[PDB]
């Protein structure tokens, strides 16, 4: 920059060593800003292009931050711009080790007061031209749930810059990432005085990513310019931009939920012992249901899980159909399942022991459970069948009313409903009531005298003939007949007249022998 000069009147300080008044001028650049001189021994420039050589010391820098024209005369504690300027130049020379305080003799106490203040500030304050840049916090951060999002805390840019901005550059980050400031405003490029926070949708699988903070900072700096060495070096306080980038900042998170399986029967009741296979890619586990019908799994990575019954409870139907359920971040997905009771049937067919093809109706069977309580009764139909729909478990049954004309069956049978829809078919046999008629034929005069050749004929309740038989020897004629009411009469005489009385009898007990005596005449 080309530099330009302007003189003024002042109560100059005197140097005892140099034996002269210490003077200066106001030096101004082409743009208009005020430059200061770095030594009182060489003259200031007039209309010469001066090249940059670097920076002054931080001590000299601190004088310019605190002095004129950064601050005006009233703020600094002096009366005029000339007094403000002169005290600043003197403090610049003292901080640069070109003059010492004890060598100078002041002629203006306002000027002397300000010079002391600016020199004390160069020694005590800590402002520096080294550009400082840091992102807090420095350690890798973990995002935790807050309603709809997983979120970190706030990050902040610590710097000695006067102004600047920065941009967040995430590497391979998840979908739906948002970056916000403290007012909740969505931004990727922010001012250095703003803080930022990371949001991720809660439904994001566990993971991590790296990000970088890139910034453009503006620092004040006391730039030095190189005189010809017959002409002084100068300084100008200027704003200078500077690019900075952080090291990789890591963000990580963990996304899990739970699954609760509730097991029910046909009516809303708790069910123990149901075993389910909970699975997906990366996971498999068989869980069994508890006292309260509940099976639970925690810490499941979020996503779709398959649920499949592998083993049913005691006396319940197995259902191998697959169920699909989503585990979401922070939440317990509930799966409520009903189960069907195992049901089957007993089919009793009632027949005659002598003939398997003869079916017997109206025979009653009673059914008992494991403990022996009566569960149900039922009679055989027109084809000798009795049907009983029953639930799971072990049972017994007995004949409790015999069919008409049969001896009751005394045995106890057993069966079990194991499998669903099973039909157990049983055959029960029955002994028919059969008996004998024995007619001893004697003469009406002589008792204990035989009569062969006497034929008797036996008729049923309706009156139709059944059997004929002559008297064998000793007057005896045997006839084996089934249950029922009958009548009988003499057909053929043994040289005797026929006894034409119509006798009657009933066979009603098995193995029974009915002994009758008929007598003949002439
Ligand atoms: Zn200060
Ligand atoms: Zn003084
Ligand atoms: Zn640490
Ligand atoms: Zn009863």
Author numbering: 4 to 497, 499 to 526
Copy text from the publication.
An increasing number of surface‐associated proteins identified in Gram‐positive bacteria are characterized by intramolecular cross‐links in structurally conserved thioester, isopeptide, and ester domains (TIE proteins). TEDs are predicted at the distal end of a large number of surface proteins from Gram‐positive bacteria, and the name TIE (thioester, isopeptide, ester) proteins have been introduced for this family. Internal thioester bonds, formed between Cys and Gln side‐chains and first identified in the second thioester domain (TED) of the Streptococcus pyogenes minor pilin Cpa,3 play a negligible role in protein stability, but are suggested to mediate covalent bacterial adhesion. Structures of Bacillus anthracis, vancomycin‐resistant Staphylococcus aureus, and vancomycin‐resistant Enterococcus faecium TEDs show a head domain with Class I topology extended by a β‐sandwich; the latter contributes the thioester bond‐forming Gln via a β‐hairpin insertion into the head domain.
A BaTIE construct (Glu35‐Lys557 of the full, translated open reading frame) was designed to exclude both the N‐terminal Sec secretion signal peptide (Met1‐Ala34), and a 38‐residue C‐terminal region upstream of the LPATG putative sorting motif predicted to be natively unfolded. Its experimental molecular mass (58,441 Da) was determined by ESI‐MS as 70 Da lighter than predicted, consistent with the formation of a single thioester bond (evolving one molecule of ammonia) and three isopeptide bonds (evolving two molecules of ammonia and one water molecule). The crystal structure of BaTIE was determined to 2.58 Å resolution using Se‐SAD phasing and standard refinement approaches. Continuous electron density between the Cys71 and Gln266 side‐chains of BaTIE confirms the presence of a thioester bond in this position, consistent with previous data. Further, continuous electron density between Lys297/Asn373, Lys384/Asp464, and Lys475/Asn555 side‐chains reflects the presence of isopeptide bonds, positioned adjacent to putative catalytic residues Glu343, Glu443, and Glu524, respectively. In both chains of BaTIE in the asymmetric unit (ASU), the electron density for IPD3 gets progressively weaker the farther away from IPD2 the residues are positioned, suggesting flexibility of IPD3 in the crystal. The BaTIE ASU contains seven bound metal ions in three unique sites. The third site is coordinated by Asp142 and Gln144 side‐chains belonging to two neighboring ASUs, and two water molecules. It is likely these are zinc ions derived from the crystallization condition and are unlikely to be biologically significant, given that crystal packing is a prerequisite for co‐ordination. To test collagen binding of BaTIE in its full‐length, enzyme‐linked immunosorbence assays were performed using a BaTIE‐Flag tag fusion. These static adhesion assays strongly suggest that BaTIE does not interact with Collagens I–IV or gelatin.
